[PDB]
Amino acid sequence: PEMVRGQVFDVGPRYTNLSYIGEGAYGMVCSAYDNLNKVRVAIKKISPFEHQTYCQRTLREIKILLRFRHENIIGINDIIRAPTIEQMKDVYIVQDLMETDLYKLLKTQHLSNDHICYFLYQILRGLKYIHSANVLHRDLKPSNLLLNTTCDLKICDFGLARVADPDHDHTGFLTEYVATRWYRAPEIMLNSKGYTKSIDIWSVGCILAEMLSNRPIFPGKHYLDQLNHILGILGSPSQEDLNCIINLKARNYLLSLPHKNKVPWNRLFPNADSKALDLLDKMLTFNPHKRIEVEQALAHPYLEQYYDPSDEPIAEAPFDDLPKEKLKELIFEETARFQ
Numbered sequence: 001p002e003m004v005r006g007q008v009f010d011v012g013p014r015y016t017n018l019s020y021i022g023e024g025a026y027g028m029v030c031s032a033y034d035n036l037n038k039v040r041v042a043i044k045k046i047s048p049f050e051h052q053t054y055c056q057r058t059l060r061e062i063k064i065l066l067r068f069r070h071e072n073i074i075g076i077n078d079i080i081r082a083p084t085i086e087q088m089k090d091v092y093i094v095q096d097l098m099e100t101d102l103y104k105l106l107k108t109q110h111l112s113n114d115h116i117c118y119f120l121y122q123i124l125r126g127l128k129y130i131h132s133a134n135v136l137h138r139d140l141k142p143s144n145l146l147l148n149t150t151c152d153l154k155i156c157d158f159g160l161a162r163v164a165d166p167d168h169d170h171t172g173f174l175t176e177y178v179a180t181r182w183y184r185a186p187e188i189m190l191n192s193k194g195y196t197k198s199i200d201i202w203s204v205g206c207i208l209a210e211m212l213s214n215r216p217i218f219p220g221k222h223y224l225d226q227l228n229h230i231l232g233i234l235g236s237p238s239q240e241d242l243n244c245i246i247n248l249k250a251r252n253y254l255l256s257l258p259h260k261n262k263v264p265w266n267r268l269f270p271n272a273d274s275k276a277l278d279l280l281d282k283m284l285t286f287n288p289h290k291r292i293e294v295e296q297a298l299a300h301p302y303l304e305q306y307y308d309p310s311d312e313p314i315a316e317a318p319f320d321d322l323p324k325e326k327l328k329e330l331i332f333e334e335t336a337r338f339q
Protein backbone atom coordinates (compact mmCIF):
# COMPACT_ATOMS: atom_id res chain seq x y z
CA PRO A 1 0.00 0.00 0.00
CA GLU A 2 0.97 3.68 -0.67
CA MET A 3 2.26 5.55 2.41
CA VAL A 4 1.79 9.31 3.01
CA ARG A 5 3.85 11.45 5.46
CA GLY A 6 4.93 8.48 7.58
CA GLN A 7 1.48 6.81 7.64
CA VAL A 8 -0.41 3.93 5.89
CA PHE A 9 -3.13 5.05 3.45
CA ASP A 10 -4.58 1.69 2.40
CA VAL A 11 -7.02 2.60 -0.42
CA GLY A 12 -5.85 0.63 -3.43
CA PRO A 13 -6.19 -0.49 -6.10
CA ARG A 14 -9.17 1.73 -7.09
CA TYR A 15 -7.48 4.84 -5.74
CA THR A 16 -3.88 5.61 -6.66
CA ASN A 17 -1.32 8.44 -7.03
CA LEU A 18 -1.88 9.87 -3.50
CA SER A 19 -0.97 13.43 -2.47
CA TYR A 20 -1.22 14.88 1.06
CA ILE A 21 -3.84 17.64 1.46
CA GLY A 22 -3.79 18.21 5.23
CA GLU A 23 -5.13 17.42 8.66
CA GLY A 24 -8.80 17.61 9.49
CA ALA A 25 -10.79 16.89 12.67
CA TYR A 26 -10.64 13.09 11.89
CA GLY A 27 -6.99 12.80 10.83
CA MET A 28 -5.10 12.90 7.51
CA VAL A 29 -6.76 13.75 4.21
CA CYS A 30 -5.24 13.04 0.77
CA SER A 31 -6.22 13.42 -2.84
CA ALA A 32 -6.09 10.34 -5.09
CA TYR A 33 -6.87 9.33 -8.60
CA ASP A 34 -10.08 7.26 -8.87
CA ASN A 35 -9.31 4.65 -11.61
CA LEU A 36 -13.03 3.90 -12.07
CA ASN A 37 -14.49 7.48 -12.39
CA LYS A 38 -11.23 8.84 -13.98
CA VAL A 39 -11.08 11.90 -11.65
CA ARG A 40 -9.11 12.98 -8.59
CA VAL A 41 -10.99 12.67 -5.28
CA ALA A 42 -10.39 13.38 -1.57
CA ILE A 43 -9.95 10.52 0.92
CA LYS A 44 -10.08 11.04 4.69
CA LYS A 45 -8.47 8.32 6.86
CA ILE A 46 -10.32 7.82 10.23
CA SER A 47 -8.94 5.66 13.08
CA PRO A 48 -11.56 6.00 15.88
CA PHE A 49 -12.12 2.57 17.40
CA GLU A 50 -10.05 2.92 20.60
CA HIS A 51 -12.29 5.73 21.92
CA GLN A 52 -16.07 5.81 22.49
CA THR A 53 -16.25 9.59 21.72
CA TYR A 54 -14.31 9.21 18.42
CA CYS A 55 -16.69 6.33 17.51
CA GLN A 56 -19.78 8.47 18.29
CA ARG A 57 -18.55 11.37 16.14
CA THR A 58 -17.52 9.10 13.22
CA LEU A 59 -20.83 7.25 13.28
CA ARG A 60 -22.78 10.55 13.21
CA GLU A 61 -20.70 11.92 10.33
CA ILE A 62 -21.23 8.72 8.29
CA LYS A 63 -24.91 8.09 9.14
CA ILE A 64 -25.95 11.69 8.36
CA LEU A 65 -23.86 12.11 5.18
CA LEU A 66 -25.18 8.82 3.74
CA ARG A 67 -28.82 9.73 4.45
CA PHE A 68 -28.54 13.28 3.06
CA ARG A 69 -28.55 13.93 -0.68
CA HIS A 70 -28.28 17.65 -1.57
CA GLU A 71 -26.12 19.73 -3.94
CA ASN A 72 -24.88 21.96 -1.07
CA ILE A 73 -23.95 19.10 1.31
CA ILE A 74 -20.76 17.10 0.73
CA GLY A 75 -21.56 13.54 -0.23
CA ILE A 76 -19.84 10.28 0.56
CA ASN A 77 -18.86 8.65 -2.74
CA ASP A 78 -17.32 5.50 -1.26
CA ILE A 79 -16.11 4.09 2.07
CA ILE A 80 -13.10 1.75 2.23
CA ARG A 81 -12.53 -0.62 5.15
CA ALA A 82 -11.55 -4.20 5.91
CA PRO A 83 -14.05 -7.02 5.12
CA THR A 84 -14.43 -8.04 8.78
CA ILE A 85 -14.92 -6.19 12.06
CA GLU A 86 -11.87 -8.01 13.49
CA GLN A 87 -9.63 -6.61 10.70
CA MET A 88 -11.15 -3.14 10.60
CA LYS A 89 -8.73 -0.64 12.25
CA ASP A 90 -9.39 2.35 9.98
CA VAL A 91 -12.13 3.61 7.69
CA TYR A 92 -11.51 5.78 4.59
CA ILE A 93 -14.21 8.18 3.44
CA VAL A 94 -14.05 9.18 -0.27
CA GLN A 95 -15.57 12.56 -1.21
CA ASP A 96 -15.49 14.93 -4.19
CA LEU A 97 -12.19 16.83 -4.40
CA MET A 98 -12.72 20.52 -3.62
CA GLU A 99 -10.42 23.37 -4.63
CA THR A 100 -10.47 25.30 -1.33
CA ASP A 101 -12.53 26.17 1.71
CA LEU A 102 -14.05 29.46 2.85
CA TYR A 103 -11.51 29.80 5.70
CA LYS A 104 -8.61 29.71 3.27
CA LEU A 105 -10.38 32.07 0.82
CA LEU A 106 -11.16 34.63 3.52
CA LYS A 107 -7.49 34.67 4.58
CA THR A 108 -6.27 35.87 1.15
CA GLN A 109 -9.11 36.88 -1.14
CA HIS A 110 -11.50 39.81 -1.19
CA LEU A 111 -15.02 38.53 -2.04
CA SER A 112 -17.20 40.44 -4.58
CA ASN A 113 -20.78 41.23 -3.35
CA ASP A 114 -21.87 38.74 -6.08
CA HIS A 115 -19.70 35.98 -4.46
CA ILE A 116 -20.98 36.85 -0.95
CA CYS A 117 -24.59 36.69 -2.16
CA TYR A 118 -23.98 33.37 -4.02
CA PHE A 119 -22.11 31.77 -1.09
CA LEU A 120 -24.76 32.85 1.42
CA TYR A 121 -27.53 31.54 -0.81
CA GLN A 122 -25.82 28.13 -1.09
CA ILE A 123 -25.17 27.91 2.69
CA LEU A 124 -28.80 28.70 3.44
CA ARG A 125 -30.10 26.35 0.71
CA GLY A 126 -28.07 23.47 2.22
CA LEU A 127 -29.14 24.54 5.74
CA LYS A 128 -32.83 24.46 4.75
CA TYR A 129 -32.40 20.81 3.84
CA ILE A 130 -30.52 19.98 7.05
CA HIS A 131 -33.09 21.76 9.24
CA SER A 132 -35.95 20.10 7.29
CA ALA A 133 -34.50 16.69 8.43
CA ASN A 134 -34.81 18.04 12.05
CA VAL A 135 -30.98 18.08 12.23
CA LEU A 136 -28.76 20.85 13.67
CA HIS A 137 -25.25 21.10 12.22
CA ARG A 138 -23.86 22.84 15.36
CA ASP A 139 -20.40 23.61 13.93
CA LEU A 140 -20.91 25.89 10.95
CA LYS A 141 -17.78 27.93 10.27
CA PRO A 142 -15.72 28.89 7.21
CA SER A 143 -13.40 25.82 7.37
CA ASN A 144 -16.47 23.52 7.16
CA LEU A 145 -17.59 25.15 3.85
CA LEU A 146 -15.69 23.69 0.91
CA LEU A 147 -15.71 25.06 -2.63
CA ASN A 148 -14.98 23.60 -6.02
CA THR A 149 -13.34 25.42 -8.97
CA THR A 150 -16.71 26.94 -10.04
CA CYS A 151 -17.56 28.15 -6.50
CA ASP A 152 -20.16 25.44 -5.80
CA LEU A 153 -20.29 25.33 -2.01
CA LYS A 154 -20.60 22.16 0.15
CA ILE A 155 -21.40 22.04 3.86
CA CYS A 156 -19.14 19.51 5.61
CA ASP A 157 -18.62 17.70 8.93
CA PHE A 158 -21.71 16.52 10.71
CA GLY A 159 -19.67 15.02 13.63
CA LEU A 160 -21.15 17.48 16.14
CA ALA A 161 -24.68 17.37 14.73
CA ARG A 162 -27.81 16.55 16.76
CA VAL A 163 -31.53 16.05 16.25
CA ALA A 164 -33.33 19.28 17.22
CA ASP A 165 -34.85 19.14 20.68
CA PRO A 166 -36.36 22.59 21.64
CA ASP A 167 -38.09 21.22 24.80
CA HIS A 168 -34.84 20.16 26.47
CA ASP A 169 -32.85 23.28 25.36
CA HIS A 170 -32.69 25.05 28.73
CA THR A 171 -29.64 24.88 30.99
CA GLY A 172 -27.60 26.90 33.47
CA PHE A 173 -25.27 29.83 33.06
CA LEU A 174 -21.75 29.17 31.70
CA THR A 175 -22.53 25.44 30.84
CA GLU A 176 -19.63 23.92 28.85
CA TYR A 177 -20.00 23.69 25.10
CA VAL A 178 -18.13 21.80 22.30
CA ALA A 179 -18.80 23.90 19.03
CA THR A 180 -16.29 26.53 17.73
CA ARG A 181 -16.17 29.66 19.96
CA TRP A 182 -16.26 32.51 17.38
CA TYR A 183 -19.48 31.12 15.83
CA ARG A 184 -21.35 30.37 19.12
CA ALA A 185 -24.69 32.10 19.70
CA PRO A 186 -24.97 34.28 22.88
CA GLU A 187 -27.54 31.95 24.45
CA ILE A 188 -24.98 29.09 24.60
CA MET A 189 -23.15 30.98 27.33
CA LEU A 190 -26.41 31.98 29.09
CA ASN A 191 -29.05 29.27 29.07
CA SER A 192 -29.01 27.07 25.97
CA LYS A 193 -27.73 23.56 25.18
CA GLY A 194 -27.74 24.41 21.43
CA TYR A 195 -30.68 22.07 20.63
CA THR A 196 -32.66 24.56 18.50
CA LYS A 197 -32.28 25.56 14.80
CA SER A 198 -31.52 29.16 15.82
CA ILE A 199 -28.01 28.07 16.84
CA ASP A 200 -27.10 27.47 13.23
CA ILE A 201 -28.59 30.73 11.99
CA TRP A 202 -26.31 32.65 14.37
CA SER A 203 -23.27 30.84 12.94
CA VAL A 204 -24.41 31.74 9.39
CA GLY A 205 -24.72 35.38 10.48
CA CYS A 206 -21.13 35.23 11.78
CA ILE A 207 -19.93 33.78 8.44
CA LEU A 208 -21.79 36.49 6.48
CA ALA A 209 -20.06 39.21 8.63
CA GLU A 210 -16.72 37.54 8.01
CA MET A 211 -17.35 37.45 4.23
CA LEU A 212 -18.06 41.20 4.29
CA SER A 213 -14.77 42.14 6.00
CA ASN A 214 -12.33 39.15 5.84
CA ARG A 215 -12.11 39.10 9.65
CA PRO A 216 -14.21 37.25 12.29
CA ILE A 217 -16.81 39.57 13.76
CA PHE A 218 -16.65 38.13 17.34
CA PRO A 219 -13.11 36.79 17.87
CA GLY A 220 -13.42 35.85 21.58
CA LYS A 221 -10.18 34.65 23.26
CA HIS A 222 -11.94 32.29 25.73
CA TYR A 223 -15.50 31.17 26.91
CA LEU A 224 -17.04 34.33 28.56
CA ASP A 225 -14.91 36.68 26.31
CA GLN A 226 -17.11 35.43 23.50
CA LEU A 227 -20.20 37.08 25.04
CA ASN A 228 -18.19 40.36 25.67
CA HIS A 229 -17.49 40.57 21.91
CA ILE A 230 -21.14 39.87 20.95
CA LEU A 231 -22.51 42.50 23.37
CA GLY A 232 -19.77 44.94 22.32
CA ILE A 233 -21.44 45.16 18.85
CA LEU A 234 -25.11 44.33 19.55
CA GLY A 235 -25.17 46.47 22.74
CA SER A 236 -27.16 45.71 25.84
CA PRO A 237 -30.14 43.37 25.52
CA SER A 238 -33.59 44.97 25.82
CA GLN A 239 -35.79 44.43 28.86
CA GLU A 240 -38.04 42.23 26.68
CA ASP A 241 -35.03 40.02 25.67
CA LEU A 242 -33.92 39.74 29.32
CA ASN A 243 -37.47 38.73 30.35
CA CYS A 244 -37.07 35.70 28.04
CA ILE A 245 -34.07 34.57 30.22
CA ILE A 246 -35.62 33.18 33.42
CA ASN A 247 -32.42 31.73 34.86
CA LEU A 248 -31.36 34.14 37.66
CA LYS A 249 -27.59 33.72 37.31
CA ALA A 250 -27.66 34.36 33.56
CA ARG A 251 -30.11 37.31 33.81
CA ASN A 252 -28.23 38.85 36.75
CA TYR A 253 -24.93 38.61 34.94
CA LEU A 254 -26.43 40.64 32.08
CA LEU A 255 -28.00 43.15 34.46
CA SER A 256 -24.64 43.66 36.20
CA LEU A 257 -23.03 44.98 32.97
CA PRO A 258 -22.74 48.73 32.22
CA HIS A 259 -25.12 49.82 29.47
CA LYS A 260 -23.56 49.39 25.98
CA ASN A 261 -24.90 50.91 22.80
CA LYS A 262 -25.26 49.09 19.46
CA VAL A 263 -22.44 49.57 16.89
CA PRO A 264 -24.31 50.14 13.53
CA TRP A 265 -23.73 47.56 10.83
CA ASN A 266 -23.17 50.33 8.21
CA ARG A 267 -20.28 51.77 10.29
CA LEU A 268 -18.68 48.31 10.72
CA PHE A 269 -19.19 47.52 6.99
CA PRO A 270 -19.31 50.80 4.98
CA ASN A 271 -18.86 49.02 1.65
CA ALA A 272 -21.55 46.39 2.25
CA ASP A 273 -24.80 46.08 0.29
CA SER A 274 -27.58 47.56 2.50
CA LYS A 275 -29.82 44.52 1.91
CA ALA A 276 -26.92 42.24 3.07
CA LEU A 277 -26.75 44.30 6.32
CA ASP A 278 -30.48 44.07 6.89
CA LEU A 279 -30.29 40.25 6.60
CA LEU A 280 -27.12 40.19 8.78
CA ASP A 281 -29.01 42.08 11.51
CA LYS A 282 -31.87 39.54 11.42
CA MET A 283 -29.46 36.60 11.71
CA LEU A 284 -27.38 38.24 14.46
CA THR A 285 -30.43 38.92 16.63
CA PHE A 286 -29.75 38.40 20.34
CA ASN A 287 -33.12 36.79 21.22
CA PRO A 288 -33.16 33.33 19.56
CA HIS A 289 -36.96 33.31 19.29
CA LYS A 290 -36.85 36.57 17.21
CA ARG A 291 -33.86 35.42 15.12
CA ILE A 292 -34.74 34.82 11.42
CA GLU A 293 -35.31 31.13 10.36
CA VAL A 294 -33.63 29.56 7.34
CA GLU A 295 -36.63 29.74 4.99
CA GLN A 296 -37.24 33.42 5.89
CA ALA A 297 -33.58 34.16 5.28
CA LEU A 298 -33.81 32.55 1.79
CA ALA A 299 -36.81 34.83 1.03
CA HIS A 300 -34.95 38.00 2.10
CA PRO A 301 -34.58 40.71 -0.60
CA TYR A 302 -30.76 40.32 -0.54
CA LEU A 303 -31.15 36.84 -2.09
CA GLU A 304 -33.90 37.65 -4.60
CA GLN A 305 -31.78 36.85 -7.68
CA TYR A 306 -31.51 33.23 -6.43
CA TYR A 307 -34.61 32.56 -4.32
CA ASP A 308 -36.81 29.79 -5.73
CA PRO A 309 -38.50 27.59 -3.06
CA SER A 310 -39.32 24.96 -5.72
CA ASP A 311 -35.54 24.53 -6.24
CA GLU A 312 -34.62 24.53 -2.48
CA PRO A 313 -35.44 20.90 -1.65
CA ILE A 314 -36.21 19.36 1.72
CA ALA A 315 -35.43 15.94 3.21
CA GLU A 316 -37.81 13.03 2.36
CA ALA A 317 -37.82 11.85 5.97
CA PRO A 318 -36.49 13.58 9.08
CA PHE A 319 -34.06 11.97 11.61
CA ASP A 320 -24.64 8.20 23.62
CA ASP A 321 -24.16 5.38 26.25
CA LEU A 322 -23.23 2.65 23.74
CA PRO A 323 -19.74 1.18 24.37
CA LYS A 324 -17.12 1.60 21.62
CA GLU A 325 -17.49 -2.15 20.65
CA LYS A 326 -21.21 -1.54 19.87
CA LEU A 327 -20.37 1.68 17.96
CA LYS A 328 -17.69 -0.16 15.91
CA GLU A 329 -20.38 -2.73 14.94
CA LEU A 330 -22.76 0.10 13.89
CA ILE A 331 -20.03 1.76 11.82
CA PHE A 332 -19.25 -1.61 10.19
CA GLU A 333 -23.01 -2.00 9.33
CA GLU A 334 -23.35 1.64 8.13
CA THR A 335 -20.41 1.15 5.67
CA ALA A 336 -21.50 -2.30 4.38
CA ARG A 337 -23.24 -0.91 1.23
CA PHE A 338 -19.81 -0.07 -0.33
CA GLN A 339 -18.41 -3.61 -0.11
Ligand SMILES: CNC(=O)c1ccccc1Nc1cc(NC2CCOCC2)ncc1Cl
Binds near residue numbers: 021023025043099144
Ligand atom coordinates in the same frame (compact mmCIF):
# COMPACT_ATOMS: atom_id res chain seq x y z
C1 LIG B 1 -14.30 19.75 6.41
N1 LIG B 1 -12.89 19.65 6.10
C2 LIG B 1 -12.36 18.54 5.59
O1 LIG B 1 -13.04 17.52 5.27
C3 LIG B 1 -10.89 18.59 5.35
C4 LIG B 1 -10.05 19.15 6.36
C5 LIG B 1 -8.67 19.24 6.12
C6 LIG B 1 -8.14 18.79 4.89
C7 LIG B 1 -8.98 18.26 3.92
C8 LIG B 1 -10.36 18.17 4.14
N2 LIG B 1 -11.24 17.59 3.19
C9 LIG B 1 -11.29 17.87 1.85
C10 LIG B 1 -10.43 18.77 1.19
C11 LIG B 1 -10.61 19.00 -0.20
N3 LIG B 1 -9.76 19.87 -0.86
C12 LIG B 1 -8.88 20.85 -0.23
C13 LIG B 1 -9.71 21.98 0.37
C14 LIG B 1 -8.76 22.97 1.00
O2 LIG B 1 -7.86 23.52 0.03
C15 LIG B 1 -7.04 22.47 -0.53
C16 LIG B 1 -7.87 21.42 -1.23
N4 LIG B 1 -11.51 18.34 -0.93
C17 LIG B 1 -12.37 17.52 -0.30
C18 LIG B 1 -12.23 17.20 1.05
CL1 LIG B 1 -13.35 16.10 1.78
